[PDB]
Write a protein that binds this ligand. Structure first.
Ligand SMILES: C[C@@H]1Cc2c(Cl)cc(C(=O)N[C@@H](Cc3ccccc3)C(=O)O)c(O)c2C(=O)O1
Ligand SMILES: C[C@@H]1Cc2c(Cl)cc(C(=O)N[C@@H](Cc3ccccc3)C(=O)O)c(O)c2C(=O)O1
Ligand SMILES: C[C@@H]1Cc2c(Cl)cc(C(=O)N[C@@H](Cc3ccccc3)C(=O)O)c(O)c2C(=O)O1
Ligand SMILES: C[C@@H]1Cc2c(Cl)cc(C(=O)N[C@@H](Cc3ccccc3)C(=O)O)c(O)c2C(=O)O1
Ligand SMILES: [Zn+2]
Ligand SMILES: [Zn+2]
Ligand SMILES: [Zn+2]
Ligand SMILES: [Zn+2]
Ligand SMILES: [Zn+2]
Ligand SMILES: [Zn+2]
Lengths: 399, 399, 399, 142
């Protein structure tokens, strides 16, 4: 057991900063919250619940050589890099993440759960599900020789073109040990393809995916830049929409009526626009899309917040450098979202998005994921960049 | 010809113990039953019809090395073990069995019918039919290298994901010489998978399987632990439900309305719970499921019997050691089922489940499958563990 | 322990019938022989060591449908037939055999050694080694479609065409669990090919096979009908020559100088010639060879015995019906070989051919393989057809 | 990226068919049929040219030295543990090819005959050496 003494306590359920409190931690869970057994003295720090990043890619990090290192590097090298990526993420203050694509992440989650390596609690989607020529198609851009040798991808590889193939793909992801399902409803900006906002799924295919995923207890996250694919995904019944660059009034109304969550990923847009002044960074097929679609997310997210769409915290890390996830708070506040709502989007709304109930608040019976900051973010949001204390499941990783 | 003199005769059609009788056997069939030509003197023994076990796996027997001996052993070694397994089963008093999975069993049935080896009369299902990642998926748990080399299984291997694939799978089982069809409606407890009670078939797929099987004269047996898969299988029209650990009131009502048979398999649950005090026996993926789902069958079976669900005899042997099938009678009686009903569930109800009419009773025109016991099971059910006489199709195998 | 009381004892080391003796058996070995503890009374029987058949095929038995049942039957059916074949062989009086081809036999040997099934002690060669189009080529006679699908066989299948391929084939047989090596030096009479006495191995290939086999402790047996292939195999240094239909003076001189053993297989020749009066029994490609080469073995074997070539006992059973191996004694005696030498060729000489030292004689420290006959074979060789007692490794199988 | 010692890696071991380092030892015939018979790219050699190709394949994959299994082992799924599994010519070919690329050869050997063959062919070190006798000791000293 251990008694943690917070100087100030942030109530995520309400959104207010309370006074001094003492946390009682035993068996990895919070047992008591008394206002005013080892002692951890944090009377000088603001004492917060652990953050959750709902959009990360722990198996990669963008670089000038990213597109070339897909035919030379093996998954073991990616696994060796993911160790440092995960340690940096956990030390930045994020005790839980949702991985939205990649085959190394389930193995990293299993290794972290066994105590082999240090990192956050990972909810992994595994392989993304796409159509032929879609944003997540694994053989996009290959020359005809390589495509001929490797064959046309199918449901086992995540590429579907009918209802039965979608059902088989969801079952294949369940077989491989996934926690949720990720689909690419439209085209993207970083893939080796032409379109970036065209509808790539039919409504029937998305409905089949959602219906199959509901049987296995999964939730579905949909990547969407264009309006028609976003509308189709929202009407089919997905749980969250990522990016959503070209959201309009009708999509906003449908999302409000359906209770869909929106994850904007400010950081990815800002990073890809800043990496445009640099002359050689992107292939000639990707650079126009990256110049066009980026940095239009900020206005869309501000409009969505003003219109009443529920917003949750996500960064799309793996485009940006791991361990720098907290600058998304500063980006969110700069766009007009209040600091308290920005902090709630990472604790209580993130738990709602994940579909769990044992995390997000410092209440009895919940997991003991506690962090502390030197300053107060409610007045200066830059205080999120200095984390002094990190605890996860009752184990202290940074003191 | 031969005249068998039973001291006491058990009437399976009614469930009562009659007085002395003389059986007249010729050409493998019973011709005459007279109350009060070679002579077989069994005046000291209770004279019964041969038993039928509706759930066996003659091609395997569980052991501490069971999971490893799937990449080292060939089917010929399994065939060499099945000879002793079948002889033990026949000597235990069971003249007929229903094999519910395995590729060696049809060959063993053909060999026994030709007189090459000794054993009971086998009704074989062959390969089980499942979905991707299902309980009967042959490549569950393999590393990605082996899965890549062997390819994704399809209907010829028994893995289906649509209506047409299910039709093709039923036709493939018919082509390979099967007598019935077996599907896994939910997950299991002994497979290398995560879920154990999730719905793995849609209603349309099960209906397609049942409709195709009806054309070829087949019956469908469904493995089911969870409630939703059990409900789907019952509504689609299967003939019997195996295990049924999480049966509730609605499933019971549907089964009573549809006339579905229930096979609980007490022995498998008792054996898997007893093999839990032993420290190392099961893989870490299987042991929680085996600790959770086992020994909950006894209360479910007792409740089903009290509610009026038709119950038939089955053991799931191959988990337990072959030749010990008769302890299921003692388990059945311990749970509250009367001894006479327990004996009827193996003779006349088993014949109804199989869909035959020439066995189960000692009536003229029926097969001459007669056994004898030293004691009386109606007062002491432990008398089923001492079989003195075994006859099958007019041939005496134990005297 | 057990004390066996033989009425008359045959001394294999000398070849004489001694007087009454008492055998002392414990731990599966003979411990004491005393002229003149349970008691086995065999005072009325001649007490002999167990016989060894150096040429059997326990995985097959020739029939009118033999050539068709290579595309319809699976190895499991052959395994189910081999159980009865092995029991018949053991009951005929043969406690040890050398299997000279077939993939089921190593598995049968493993099953017998574990006590699963009853049979003799098997020394198995596994897959035969041949060249392209050779007598043991597994795809001889297939239409071009099947040959195209299955591909051209290589060293892993037993087909070699160079020194390195022969080395790899010997290593592959060692990997699969073989006890010796079998090659086909010439063509055959029962295969689906044209030639029956042409040289199919070069001297270098046979020398490579012998040199590789010597490293792993193996002995080499060579199938040979024609003179040139027989000469090449003898000069390369094989241990035994089978059939040897067209042996001449030079081959006899080379065999005498090299110490090569000769196994004639009277029974196979007599069978394939008796099955010639029957109109339809053999394919039109095989029947001329079977009519020509058969029954010429008797004169060749008689000439070889007169010339001083060492002769050992073998039948080529699997062409003839299993369990009838002892008629080879009558065939041997009919050709002029003395009865005592015929009995020695199956006991003390067979052990020399196998390369073992713990069997063949009833001496202390040897295995307890004892059989008994009603009559005396030294005066009437027909007494070998009535075996009354069978013991193997101290276990009585027939009394 | 991670902490550890300085590693000199041999990569895939080089063996013969059924050898101690054979990657498909003990597999049932179905798995062996699907995966195919291993060759030089997998590290299984049966001639001089195959040994040369195997050494070149290890060089291509980024190895620092070469490891061969001269005899059988004790922890593999095989029968023999001290039988000679390489011929002298094959080991000489391996050593000669490895000398061109600056590699050294380490030989696994329990039995006496395989140990003698590896020592005479010119390997750098002998591992285990359970059944070493006087003649092998003299050859090693020389
Ligand atoms: C392994 C991981 C897989 C992956 C997947 Cl499945 C999707 C994305 C992705 O949605 N990228 C975005 C990047 C982006 C850029 C700007 C604004 C929003 C998003 C895109 O190209 O549209 C993505 O960026 C990545 C990625 O970084 O690599
Ligand atoms: C070859 C044969 C195939 C087979 C199949 Cl298809 C199904 C089962 C099976 O239903 N096992 C059950 C074992 C079990 C355990 C407890 C209570 C009920 C059943 C399960 O794991 O859910 C099963 O046990 C077996 C088996 O034993 O191996
Ligand atoms: C499975 C087993 C494999 C086998 C092999 Cl590998 C070889 C022979 C064989 O040598 N048969 C002889 C039969 C024979 C007939 C007459 C005189 C001598 C031999 C032949 O055809 O020349 C042979 O007969 C058999 C056989 O019977 O089937
Ligand atoms: C991945 C790695 C590969 C490997 C290889 Cl290539 C060889 C050995 C090895 O030589 N093992 C020895 C173990 C041993 C045991 C006792 C005395 C000497 C050696 C053997 O089985 O003969 C060996 O042990 C291992 C091993 O441990 O796994
Ligand atoms: Zn995206
Ligand atoms: Zn993404
Ligand atoms: Zn089951
Ligand atoms: Zn079962
Ligand atoms: Zn032959
Ligand atoms: Zn033969």
């Amino acid at each position: 057991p251990v008694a943690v003494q917070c100087g100030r306590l942030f109530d995520a359920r309400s959104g207010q900063l309370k006074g001094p409190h003492t946390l009682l931690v035993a068996d990895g869970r919070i047992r008591q919250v008394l206002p005013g057994a080892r002692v951890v003295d944090l009377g000088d720090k603001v004492c917060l619940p652990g953050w959750t990043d709902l959009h990360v890619h722990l198996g990669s990090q963008s670089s000038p050589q990213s597109y070339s290192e897909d035919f030379r590097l093996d998954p073991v090298d990616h696994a060796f890099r993911a160790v440092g990526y995960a340690e940096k993420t956990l030390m930045a203050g994020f005790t839980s993440v949702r991985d939205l694509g990649g085959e190394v992440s389930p193995h990293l989650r299993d290794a972290i759960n066994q105590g082999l390596v240090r990192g956050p609690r990972i909810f992994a989607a595994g392989k993304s599900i796409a159509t032929t020529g879609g944003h997540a198609d694994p053989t996009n851009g290959w020359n005809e020789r390589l495509a001929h040798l490797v064959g046309a991808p199918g449901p086992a590889e995540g590429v579907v073109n009918s209802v039965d193939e979608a059902r088989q793909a969801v079952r294949q992801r369940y077989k491989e040990g996934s926690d949720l399902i990720k689909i690419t409803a439209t085209g993207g900006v970083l893939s080796y393809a032409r379109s970036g906002d065209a509808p790539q799924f039919t409504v029937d295919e998305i409905k089949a995916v959602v219906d199959t995923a509901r049987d296995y207890g999964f939730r579905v996250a949909a990547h969407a830049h264009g309006t028609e694919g976003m509308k189709r995904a929202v009407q089919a019944g997905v749980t969250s929409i990522e990016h959503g660059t070209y959201m309009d009034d009708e999509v906003m109304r449908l999302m409000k009526q359906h209770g869909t969550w929106y994850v904007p990923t400010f950081y990815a847009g800002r990073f890809v626009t800043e990496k445009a002044a640099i002359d050689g960074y992107f292939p000639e097929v990707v650079r126009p899309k990256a110049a066009r679609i980026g940095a239009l997310i900020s206005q869309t997210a501000a409009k969505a917040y003003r219109n009443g769409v529920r917003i949750a915290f996500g960064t799309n890390q793996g485009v940006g450098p791991h361990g720098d996830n907290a600058r998304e708070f500063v980006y969110m506040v700069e766009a007009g979202i209040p600091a308290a709502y920005a902090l709630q989007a990472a604790t209580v709304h993130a738990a709602q998005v994940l579909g769990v109930d044992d995390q997000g608040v410092l209440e009895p019976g919940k997991r003991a994921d506690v962090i502390a900051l030197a300053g107060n973010p409610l007045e200066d949001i830059n205080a999120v960049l200095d984390v002094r204390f990190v605890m996860k499941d009752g184990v202290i990783y940074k003191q």
